[PDB]
Design a protein around this ligand. Structure first.
Ligand SMILES: *[C@@H](C(=O)NCCc1ccccn1)C(=O)C(=O)N[C@@H](Cc1ccccc1)C(=O)N(C)C
Length: 212
């Protein structure tokens, strides 16, 4: 697989969003992967609804947190609407999937990347954007402004983001904290250190949707 991968260059990544004060990272992470796979499969880059997942995935806790796997399972079973049809409000409301008409896209399943394995994650990233988790609680992560992030951070994963690329010494991540955070909304996290958990526990729980 290539030495450098960047899904933004291939037109598979939509603009950076801001989740606000709502703990909806899981929904954002899941949506990036859906937007990516639909582009790779159909050739069309569309934006999908984080709000729908927030309101409809009852296995998750709305603005209190949730699971990317669960959100991806919901899109596989039912489907998802376009972001303009069901826009982000930043607050959990009732599931409005029904009133908004037929779904825009549907996936066929979800697979998990072999955890604690850098190679497995890089292979998945080379194929499509992947939902990954990491420890974001530390002030070093929160105040990241640029460069290759090496930490400091432990492996107490608490934030769901998405891997959209990589390079020789980094994994490119799309965060959901607005364009003013990090590298225009992105973070390049150090890879190849020999830490099985990954920098900030990056290799703990990674999922991607299956289409076709
Ligand atoms: C993610 C959330 O949105 N966190 C960001 C909060 C923040 C900080 C600064 C500025 C703006 N927003 C959310 O908590 C969440 O859903 N966390 C999950 C991640 C996870 C971890 C392991 C497996 C699956 C999902 C979480 O910690 N739990 C579900 C426990």
């Amino acid at each position: 697989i290539p030495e450098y991968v960047d899904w933004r260059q291939k037109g598979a990544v939509t603009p950076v969003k801001n989740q606000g004060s709502c703990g909806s990272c899981w929904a954002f992470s899941a949506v990036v992967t859906i937007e990516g796979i639909i582009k790779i499969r159909t050739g069309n880059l569309n934006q999908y609804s984080e709000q729908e997942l927030l309101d409809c995935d009852r296995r998750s806790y709305g603005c209190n947190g949730g699971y990317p796997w669960s959100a991806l399972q919901l899109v596989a079973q039912y489907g998802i609407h376009y972001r303009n049809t069901y826009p982000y409000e930043g607050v959990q409301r009732y599931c409005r999937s029904r009133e908004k008409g037929p779904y825009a896209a549907k996936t066929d399943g979800v697979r998990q990347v072999q955890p604690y394995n850098q190679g497995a994650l890089l292979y998945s990233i080379a194929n499509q954007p992947v939902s990954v988790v990491l420890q974001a609680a530390g002030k070093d992560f929160q105040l990241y402004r640029g460069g290759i992030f090496v930490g400091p951070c432990g492996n107490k994963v608490d934030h769901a983001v998405a891997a959209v690329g990589y390079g020789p010494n980094y994994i490119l991540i799309k965060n959901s904290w607005g364009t003013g955070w990090g590298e225009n909304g992105y973070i390049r996290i150090k890879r190849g250190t020999g830490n099985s958990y990954g920098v900030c526990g990056l290799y703990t729980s990674s999922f991607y949707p299956v289409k076709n």
